[PDB]
């Protein structure tokens, strides 16, 4: 169960795991929905859907093998699951239908059907869903005029102005050989190490990825969509996280576990926890938490999110969460750090060791492109056992003391005071 890298034209990384028996070859691209300017937003989505429709229709009738994909910010994650002993067919299909040719798939009728399906899907996502809506709005507001804030799906206005030529140009400017790993997560050992190097298994347009000019930034802003028709509320605070490949990633993740998740409709969640959960339960202040610390190569975000049925006590929820964040950098009980360490160990163990090979393939590709070499979870355990209260205190004092916050919540938000009793209260306590 050891990961092996190399560099022979295309980086090939394998993580044998004899436990599961669903071999899943894959392809991962390091430039997704961030390295592209806002005027052509949904090109990655169009690629994703043309794949997932026509190639999914073809594969099963040809052989037996599913297929999936993903995109977060810079991840043309692109996976072809299979049986343990049919990976050569998977690579043959992947060669013959994804990198070449790109003309038989991009037919007019097929492209237009994909276009209308994507339009319908983005439309009803904008209508029905809500937490993901406010999350995308949070990203957009935190990175204004930065190639990081445009959504993964896109905007209908941007979608409507795409036919072929721009999709072809993106294909020729980001499907290179410089940044295209070939993941082999599953129960394959070395066939992936050799078959990936053949006569022509090499991406078209060898060259480099065109680097964007501006890097990133941060500045606080609101994109609220205040509308009283919807029943509940939604908020999403944020403070600038830690970028991947920094010696603060894991301590930030720990700071994103002391408070932890919550769900006020469970007998096993309303009762445990920390001081804020004791202080909230007296009334029905809130209805959900979600603490997270997202990180990307450009920069990272330390998240927060609720969905509160109560609409009049929003300010009290906000004030209590802010006081907890304020005092996280003044005094933390050592037992709190210990419990956070144990819980976070559990969370990473669950995430990295899911029985589904696709998620492991995704994460292996992510790390191998960004870090350059996978960091085994064992080293994660050893390097997290040494996180002491001094380190968390220092990191919190650096990242959470009078800092810009981005908030963008839909629903009924009129009870939320606008910006000064939501920011200048974030250090008011006499430290």
């Amino acid at each position: 169960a050891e990961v092996t890298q190399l560099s022979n034209g295309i980086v090939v990384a394998t993580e044998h795991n004899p436990s599961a028996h669903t071999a899943s070859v894959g392809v991962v691209f390091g430039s997704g929905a961030a390295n592209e300017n806002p005027y052509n937003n949904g090109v990655s989505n169009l690629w994703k859907n043309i794949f997932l429709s026509k190639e999914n229709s073809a594969v099963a009738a040809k052989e037996g093998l599913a297929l999936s994909s993903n995109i977060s910010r810079d991840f043309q994650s692109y996976i072809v699951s299979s049986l343990p002993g049919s990976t050569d067919k998977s690579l043959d299909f992947l060669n013959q239908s994804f990198i070449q040719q790109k003309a038989n798939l991009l037919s007019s009728s097929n492209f237009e059907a994909t276009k209308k399906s994507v339009l319908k899907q983005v439309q009803d996502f904008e209508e029905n869903d809500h937490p993901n809506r406010v999350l995308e709005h949070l990203h957009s507001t935190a990175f204004q005029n930065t190639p990081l804030s445009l959504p993964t799906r896109g905007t209908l206005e941007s979608l409507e102005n795409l036919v072929v030529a721009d999709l072809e140009s993106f294909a020729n400017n980001h499907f290179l050989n410089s940044n295209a790993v070939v993941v082999g997560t599953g129960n394959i050992k070395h066939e992936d190490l050799v078959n990936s190097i053949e006569s022509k298994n090499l991406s078209l347009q060898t060259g480099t990825k065109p680097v964007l000019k501006k890097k990133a930034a941060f500045l606080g802003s609101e994109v609220r969509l205040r509308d009283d028709t919807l029943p509940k509320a939604w908020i999403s605070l944020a403070v600038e996280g830690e970028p991947v490949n920094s010696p603060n990633y894991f301590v930030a993740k720990l700071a994103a576990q002391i408070f932890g998740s919550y769900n006020a409709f469970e007998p096993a969640s309303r009762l445990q926890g920390i001081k804020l959960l004791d202080n909230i339960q007296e009334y029905q202040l809130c209805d959900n938490f979600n603490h997270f610390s997202l990180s990307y190569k450009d920069s990272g975000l330390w998240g927060f999110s609720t969905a509160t049925r109560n609409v009049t006590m929003i300010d009290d929820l906000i004030h209590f969460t802010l006081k907890q964040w304020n005092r996280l950098t003044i005094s933390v009980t050592d037992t709190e750090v210990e419990r956070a360490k144990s819980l976070l160990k559990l969370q990473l163990g669950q995430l990295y060791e899911s029985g589904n090979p696709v998620n492991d393939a995704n994460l292996l590709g992510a790390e191998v492109l960004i870090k350059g070499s996978k960091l085994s979870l064992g080293e994660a355990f050893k390097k997290i056992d040494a996180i002491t209260v001094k380190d968390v205190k220092a990191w919190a004092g650096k990242r959470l003391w009078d800092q810009d916050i981005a908030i963008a919540g839909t629903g009924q938000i009129e009870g939320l005071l606008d910006y000064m009793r939501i920011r200048s209260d974030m250090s008011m306590m006499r430290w």
């Binding site: 001081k275 004791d278 050592d334 037992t335 210990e338």
Partner: protein, 126 residues
Amino acid sequence: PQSFTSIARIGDYILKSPVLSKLCVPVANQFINLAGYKKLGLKFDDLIAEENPIMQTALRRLPEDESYARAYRIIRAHQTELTHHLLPRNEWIKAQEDVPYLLPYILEAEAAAKEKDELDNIEVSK
């Protein structure tokens, strides 16, 4: 305010021993009979302060058939104290009928609250 866990401990310690029991139980009954609430209609499961949150939970846990009786007893007591008379010596509470039914619903809740309030200040464990 003084929890019933300490009262239970002191009561068990006093009552279990034979000599202190023989010296203390004869005066307790006389004290209760001289107190006054017995004649006016109060059961001791009612006279306690019933406003602090743990007693509030205890009251919330009571079955119906005792809560209704408690309501009747307290309203009748309010009335009789209003009229300055005493109840006739036929509807008083007998000596053997002052049974504590509300005590366990306080001890259990108090134990839960005490042993949860301590649990937050836990240590690294070893």
